[PDB]
Design a protein around this ligand. Structure first.
Ligand SMILES: Nc1ncnc2c1ncn2[C@@H]1O[C@H](COP(=O)(O)OP(=O)(O)OP(=O)(O)O)[C@@H](O)[C@H]1O
Ligand SMILES: Nc1ncnc2c1ncn2[C@@H]1O[C@H](COP(=O)(O)OP(=O)(O)OP(=O)(O)O)[C@@H](O)[C@H]1O
Ligand SMILES: Nc1ncnc2c1ncn2[C@@H]1O[C@H](COP(=O)(O)OP(=O)(O)O)[C@@H](O)[C@H]1O
Ligand SMILES: [Mg+2]
Ligand SMILES: [Mg+2]
Ligand SMILES: [Mg+2]
Lengths: 173, 458, 52, 513, 52, 460, 85
């Protein structure tokens, strides 16, 4: 998957967007450049052997919205190195860098029932203590959880489910 | 549900929805023109791609074909319904008879029996063949391997062992044709039908004709039938027509599966792939498998990885030499390289053990003299060294034997030799009881009585 | 031959332990799910957010 | 009896008493591919190298490649049930095995689960599978014997307590036979045994465990198994699992003897893992670190000084030096010592025993080649009686083989030469010995005294075998107090030489071969 | 010995049917972190007799 | 402060990403906490932007992606001078003998350039070893380099122990011993041997140990050189012993594949000759002070073709080749006279008396090696009576080159012998002429002087 | 999929002004240093076998002209050279 080759570009675009105070636009800009990449006929062209420049200028034409001389030049760089199919992974990494820089985390919370909201006030206040970041909740109701709740944040998990605790107990043959 | 996304030789990549990706070793199915093709799943790549081997010809496959996900491994008929019929790797009937009256089907991928289940046995099994049960005798429930190069006698020897063992034995038998000649499958089938012994034998054939994927899996189809008869509590004979072809079909696909080459270009998994097959061919406290395997030796190189790995798996090993076979001594067994776990004074007893070690000592000493003799000639030897040579040459000739299956070649009638006659015979030669007979007297005579009658007419 | 049966003794005990445990937790899943309560569910959350 | 099962149904309730409902926190990943026992995992930012990663079921993997954006790991078990998108949890744990005295007489796998079916283990806790050896200042010099019971090895190629001695040769030359006879002979020496089976077929293990059980030897022995069926990571890791069990005795002032069988196959399993992980191949397609694989394994076998034991035991055991002795086995393809794995292991060890096919077919069994075999500890490992006699044997016997070649067309033989070729044939005949028939010190010493004082010299060669059998029989009935003296002391003096002279003079007159 | 221990094995299975009922509630009470006088004991005894 | 982060761990090789303006220099040391234990990394390569590829000076086990790395702006520096004497150190120059802190006044980087061409010296003062075959066939000089070549089990260690006994006790000056790739058992036995003989105060010991991660072995040899270079620059005359130079090269091979280099020859790194030359060219005697060194060289399978031994032959001054073909006969020291050689063996040093004696012995043994082929098939009766006499006197000289060492009594059981150079020459002349034509061959074997070979003949 | 001199600050330079050919062909910067080889970004007018001058009055020979960089071999001690020189 493209993640490893997308990292160098994602940093440079975010760094540049910080200097020029344009991070929001750049996000909405990369969101278009990723989406044109997903179109079928455009995809065929990208898998083709068109020389970089001829590929780039035919891409840039479709990406009309792109800020000329900044967003459009970022395409020319990626076209020299044939990374254009990585654009969906150059985005999202840009969003990750942004969320780190804005000291903000999406955190997820999965339970047998819709949580009581008052509980979510406690959970968010706890997560803002566990991690020194503002925490957006987007919790879920799930049938698999017999009772209780899972808290998931980045790649750290705190299982509070009865499902997990039974299958944690069933372990001791 | 799936889509084909690459086709590289025998290997096909299929994409599935990420909620639905097939397990490893699942069977998939795809329509290829006017026939159905099965694919077996080997690896899960990322992103719902899955990499598979075609159980049939992959020519005419397009990209973008729709693939059906069967929820199970390759499963084959087992039990008495298979007896007397010829079946394919997929467990399909290949004789022109009707469908197989299966009651049960078993997945060809299985775990070996646990360490607690295994059983020991020391019951010596007799053979017709002077050199084999003298030099490398073997037990009921053990494994035998015939190692040799191209054209040395692996099949003819296995056909005598079938004739001798599998007709004085009373239980069922399984013969697995793995990457060998189709003519020899047809020749075998008939003489089984002409002898009316066919109804005790299940036959599975995956000959060289077939595409890689067939030659790879067909050995496991054969074991899975033999494991049903063993677990039923029977004593079973399993014959494998060439085990080397299983490893070679792994080599052919391994690069297309994206695995770095090892050693002499073999797959890196060679020892695990061989071991996971070999560990299933074991006798157990519930029931027994006696096994004979032919083992082709590429370029006669016994130090090649594929022979070298096979040697640790087996209880008796008989090694066939092109250098002997070009003398026309048959069976072309090398007694200085052939060996068995059963050549032990406790199981064989002392007379047999002493006779075998005497023969081994004289023939070794003859190898030590041959480099002197080649430059100097024999006249320079000592008068005891000349007696060692004069005996060793008689020993080499007396290891020769007429075979009932070989009558079509030599014309001469075959011989079955009791173990007692072999020990008595070789013990007499080494003691010098026969030092007055010519060498020609010993070549291709069944028993030592027959050497002295041949000597009267020279 | 006698020491063999006192090895066999331990094999028979351990196999029965395995049986009763797995059928015990299979019962426990049915028993606990049917006995779920919203105050008890809230009390799970109220415990873990106190130590988290 | 089985109402004790009913009583431990209360013990099942005692698990509930010990169990804890607390929510932990742990780091998480997803499996992104599965192939040939290797998995790639995305996530696990806090995975450490060599950590145990825990999978669905009760299955584990070892993290080996920590690349950027993915972890590569090997599955310690059957892999085929794993799938892409399975969640996976990183523990904090390194791999550990059960260890202790309770292990003796058990057959366990490389994870230490018993496979003999004799019920659960008894053990004294767990120890890490990977561990650093005792450093230079913590060792003591090797100067005690471990007896093989073979005339050839104990005379010519003495093994001391804490040595590493390579057994090397081609297939079917007696490599395993020598090593399990070395186990069998420890039945009463006080040295604990470990046999590690890497990549063997399970029925061969079941047969060797049977022979250990026909003799008295199984009660003193741990058997660690990774059969040819098991995954390439269960093997590879087995020698280390065996060493961790041997170290428990080594660090409490006890002696252990560990036989790693087919260290070569450990290398083949490690090559499989390395190529499936796409690490660059080196010579002969092995990875380059394959020397580091074996050298760190074999440098664990050591004799430690008493101070190290006292520190480890926290003063419970004082004044006792502990030792672990390793006997690795290598298979050569055609006597070719130049292969990469043989050259590495020959570099590491404190000596080698070469077994070879030409001697074995000639009937010289055990087939020990006196010339290319050597012990780097030598006489410091022997008892004084064996030390005194055997030093003459091995180099004389090597020169006999040179002299016999140069002689082969010489008709006149000078008396020094005629004597040497005669003596050398009679010593070559004397060192042959039957399998499972180990000889005590006093028996070996007496038979060497017969050769080095020339009592054999007149005896006709095929009778030399019967001469030895009759001499051992005679001395055991008539002169057993001296056998006890020699076996207990290992001593040698003028009265010992005199009493042995008297016994040889008396036997050779009075008895018949 | 095999005949003798198989007699003991069927006898132990009968007594542990009672003991495993106690197991299931003890597990459930720790897993729910609270003692529970649950009403639907029909579900316990149904599984208890049917699977054993 | 801690400013890099770990970004990969594969085996012994660790990649660290620093900020693009503070990238570590090549061969800089770096520091990281591997749990409780502090670990050091040495920088090998700068690659990409900000990333550096490094070798761990210790186990990789337990490293994580993400750990903070501190940048030490110097290479690995080790204690040097008198404080080192009587101590055992690891590669990092840390005490491993439990005796306490080293107490140094100065520390030196292990990476430094060789002496310049103007600084070298040619002072080939002959040095006596007391070993017959070495002093005749391959005479040492003070300040030279000596290599003991051989495959496994041929006598490299006990020869070096004999040389350490004879010169290094007599030397009256400091010594360094580098245990590169040594067995931990033998490193212990040497430390007690030097202590019990009470010479340990003259010697400083650096040990690599085989067990240690690949990084330690690669650099322990440079640590040994750096202590010896400190004593040389003081102006002292020092002895340097190296327990195996081969294992320095073999440690490079392990990491070299992971450092991304493509391979060459029989699997060796491409840099093999550069790495060998950079080490060996520091071990030289300048105008200020002399280093005399003895190096053991492992020869894989005794194949002297192999690139690692074949390359080192060019850097030495005397080379002693120990052969398994001789060792198979048990005739230690097992030095092959037809392959061993020295720069000092010419009449302008040795004088004509010694030169004529060594050339004589070589010519007799060479001739006998041809005659030996005829005999094995045609038999010795088929020779000329001149060739029969040459075969006899050669086969005696072959045994007379043997000598028991009083570091080998544990193997032999017999008292070791020392010989003067003067007595050695007289003995070989005596076999080359008639004086001992009448003694058997076995009357020479492991004797000592010629003056006592007659006595073994009377005993034989 | 792997990186070929795709490094963050070089990428950022191009985004600001893609036409960096406006800077002189005569000069460049070191971007890697290993084993006596350096890789140089720039030197658009380099030629096969040309001498490149390094700090400390040192030289390297230009031996690979690649599409993005020059590979050059240092004619002296190299271990103090650093990226961004
Ligand atoms: N016992 C025998 N008596 C006479 N001829 C024999 C004997 N054994 C082998 N041969 C000769 O060798 C030929 C080949 O033998 P066989 O077919 O068994 O070889 P193989 O080892 O199976 O070779 P392949 O590897 O090609 O299958 C036979 O056709 C026959 O000509
Ligand atoms: N001292 C002995 N005297 C007689 N026979 C022996 C002796 N030692 C071993 N053998 C026999 O040699 C054969 C092989 O021995 P063993 O299995 O130890 O060899 P191996 O080298 O381990 O074989 P493999 O390479 O298959 O492991 C067996 O039949 C054994 O009985
Ligand atoms: N000069 C010698 N005298 C007696 N035995 C020796 C001699 N040299 C070597 N040996 C024998 O060879 C063995 C190995 O030699 P050693 O030097 O210890 O190994 P290496 O040569 O590999 O360093 C010694 O233990 C001893 O058995
Ligand atoms: Mg055939
Ligand atoms: Mg074996
Ligand atoms: Mg050595």
């Amino acid at each position: 998957e493209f993640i490893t080759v997308a990292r160098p570009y994602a940093k440079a675009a975010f760094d540049f967007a910080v200097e020029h105070q344009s991070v929001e636009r750049w996000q909405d800009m990369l969101a278009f450049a990723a989406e044109v990449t997903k179109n079928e006929q455009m995809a065929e062209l990208l898998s083709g052997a068109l020389a970089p420049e001829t590929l780039a200028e035919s891409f840039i034409a479709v990406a009309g919205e792109q800020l000329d001389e900044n967003g459009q030049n970022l395409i020319r760089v990626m076209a020299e190195n044939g990374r254009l199919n990585a654009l969906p992974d150059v985005l999202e990494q840009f969003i990750h860098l942004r969320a780190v820089s804005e000291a903000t985390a999406e955190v997820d919370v999965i339970s047998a029932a819709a949580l009581s909201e008052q509980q979510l006030a406690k959970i968010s206040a706890a997560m803002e203590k566990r991690l020194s970041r503002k925490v957006k909740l987007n919790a879920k109701i799930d049938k698999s959880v017999m009772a209780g709740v899972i808290i998931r944040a980045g790649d750290m998990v705190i299982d509070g489910s009865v499902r997990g605790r039974l299958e944690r107990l069933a372990d001791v043959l | 549900t799936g889509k084909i996304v690459q086709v590289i030789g025998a290997v096909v990549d299929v994409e599935f929805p990420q909620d639905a990706v097939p397990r490893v070793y699942d069977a998939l199915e795809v329509q290829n023109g006017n026939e159905r093709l099965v694919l077996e799943v080997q690896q899960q790549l990322g992103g719902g791609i899955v990499r598979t081997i075609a159980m049939g010809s992959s020519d005419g496959l397009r990209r973008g074909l729709d693939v059906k996900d069967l929820e199970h491994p390759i499963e084959v008929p087992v039990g008495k319904a298979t007896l007397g019929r010829i079946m394919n790797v997929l467990g399909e009937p290949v004789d022109m008879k009707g469908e197989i009256g299966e009651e049960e089907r078993w997945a060809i991928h299985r775990a070996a029996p646990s360490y607690e289940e295994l059983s020991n046995s020391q019951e010596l099994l007799e053979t017709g063949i002077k050199v084999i049960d003298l030099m490398a005798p073997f037990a009921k429930g053990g494994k035998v391997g015939l190692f040799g190069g191209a054209g040395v006698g692996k099949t003819v020897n296995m056909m005598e062992l079938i004739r001798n063992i599998a007709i004085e034995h009373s239980g069922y038998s399984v013969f697995a044709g793995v990457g060998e000649r189709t003519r020899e499958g047809n020749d075998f089938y008939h003489e089984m039908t002409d002898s009316n012994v066919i109804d005790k034998v299940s036959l599975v054939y995956g000959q060289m004709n077939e595409p890689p994927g067939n030659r790879l899996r067909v050995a496991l189809t054969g074991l899975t039938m033999a494991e049903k008869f063993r677990d039923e509590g029977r004593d079973v004979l399993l014959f494998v027509d060439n085990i080397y072809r299983y490893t070679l079909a792994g080599t052919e696909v391994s690069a297309l599966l994206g695995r770095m080459p090892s050693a002499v270009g073999y797959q890196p998994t060679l020892a695990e792939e061989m071991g996971v097959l070999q560990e299933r061919i074991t006798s157990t406290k519930t029931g027994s498998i006696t096994s004979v395997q032919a083992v082709y030796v590429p370029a006669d190189d016994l130090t090649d990885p594929s022979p070298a790995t096979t040697f640790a798996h087996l209880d008796a090993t008989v090694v066939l030499s092109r250098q002997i076979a070009s003398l026309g001594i048959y069976p072309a067994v090398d007694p200085l390289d052939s060996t068995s776990r059963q050549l032990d004074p406790l199981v064989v007893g002392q007379e047999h053990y002493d006779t075998a070690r005497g023969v081994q000592s004289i023939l070794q000493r003859y190898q030590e003299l041959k480099d002197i003799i080649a430059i100097l000639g024999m006249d320079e030897l000592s008068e005891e060294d000349k007696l060692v040579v004069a005996r060793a040459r008689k020993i080499q000739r007396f290891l020769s034997q007429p075979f009932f299956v070989a009558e079509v070649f030599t014309g001469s009638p075959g011989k079955y030799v009791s173990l007692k006659d072999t020990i008595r015979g070789f013990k007499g030669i080494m003691e010098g009881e026969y030092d007055h007979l010519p060498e020609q007297a010993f070549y291709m005579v069944g028993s030592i009585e027959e050497a002295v009658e041949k000597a009267k007419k020279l | 031959a006698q020491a063999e049966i006192e090895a066999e003794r331990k094999r028979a005990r351990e196999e029965l332990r395995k049986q009763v445990a797995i059928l015990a937790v299979a019962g426990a899943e049915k028993i606990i799910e049917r006995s779920v309560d919203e105050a008890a569910n809230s009390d799970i959350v109220d415990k873990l957010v106190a130590e988290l | 009896m089985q109402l004790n099962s009913t009583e431990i149904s209360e013990l099942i309730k005692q698990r509930i008493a010990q169990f804890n409902v607390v929510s932990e926190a742990h780091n998480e990943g997803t499996i992104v591919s599965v192939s040939d026992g290797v998995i790639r995992i995305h996530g696990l930012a806090d995975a450490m190298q060599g950590e145990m990663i825990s999978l669905p079921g009760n299955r584990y993997a070892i993290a080996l490649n920590l690349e950027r954006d993915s972890v590569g790991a090997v599955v310690m078990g059957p892999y085929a049930d794993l799938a892409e998108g399975m969640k996976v949890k990183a523990t904090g744990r390194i791999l550990e095995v059960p260890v202790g005295r309770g292990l003796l007489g058990r057959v366990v796998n490389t994870l230490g689960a018993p496979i003999d079916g004799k019920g659960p283990l008894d053990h004294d806790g767990f120890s890490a599978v990977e561990a650093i050896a005792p450093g230079v200042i913590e060792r003591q010099s090797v100067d005690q014997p471990v007896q093989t019971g073979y005339k050839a090895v104990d005379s010519m190629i003495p093994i001391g307590r804490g040595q590493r001695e390579l057994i090397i040769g081609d297939r079917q030359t007696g490599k395993t036979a020598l090593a399990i006879d070395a186990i069998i002979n420890q039945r009463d020496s006080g040295i604990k045994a470990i046999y590690v089976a890497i990549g063997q077929k399970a029925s061969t293990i079941s047969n060797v465990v049977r022979k250990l059980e026909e003799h008295g030897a199984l009660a003193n022995t741990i058997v660690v198994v990774a059969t040819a069926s098991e995954s390439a990571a269960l093997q590879y890791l087995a020698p280390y699992a065996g060493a961790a069990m041997g170290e428990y005795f080594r660090d409490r002032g006890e002696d252990a003897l560990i036989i790693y069988d087919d260290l070569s196959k450990q290398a083949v399993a490690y090559r499989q893992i390395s190529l499936l992980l796409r690490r660059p191949p080196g010579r002969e397609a092995f990875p380059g670190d394959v020397f580091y694989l074996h050298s760190r394994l074999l440098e664990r076998a050591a004799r430690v000084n008493a101070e190290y034991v006292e520190a480890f035991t926290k003063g419970e055991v004082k004044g006792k030096t502990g030792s672990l002795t390793a006997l690795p086995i290598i298979e050569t393809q055609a006597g070719d010592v130049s292969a990469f794995v043989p050259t590495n292991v020959i570099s590491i060890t404190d000596g080698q025993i070469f077994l070879e096919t030409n001697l074995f077919n000639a009937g010289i069994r055990p087939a020990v080649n006196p010339g290319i075999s050597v012990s780097r500890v030598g006489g410091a490992a022997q008892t004084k009686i064996m030390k005194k006699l055997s030093g003459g044997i091995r180099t004389a016997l090597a020169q006999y083989r040179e002299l016999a070649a140069f002689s082969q067309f010489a008709s006149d033989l000078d008396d020094a030469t005629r004597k040497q070729l005669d003596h050398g044939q009679k010593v070559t005949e004397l060192l042959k010995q039957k399998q499972y028939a180990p000889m005590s010190v006093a028996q070996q010493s007496l038979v060497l005294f017969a050769a080095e004082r020339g009592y054999l010299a007149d005896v006709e060669l095929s009778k030399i075998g019967s001469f030895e059998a009759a001499l051992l029989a005679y001395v055991d009935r008539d002169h057993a107090p001296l056998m006890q003296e020699i076996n207990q002391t290992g001593g040698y003096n003028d009265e010992i030489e005199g009493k042995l002279k008297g016994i040889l003079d008396s036997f050779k007159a009075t008895q018949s071969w």
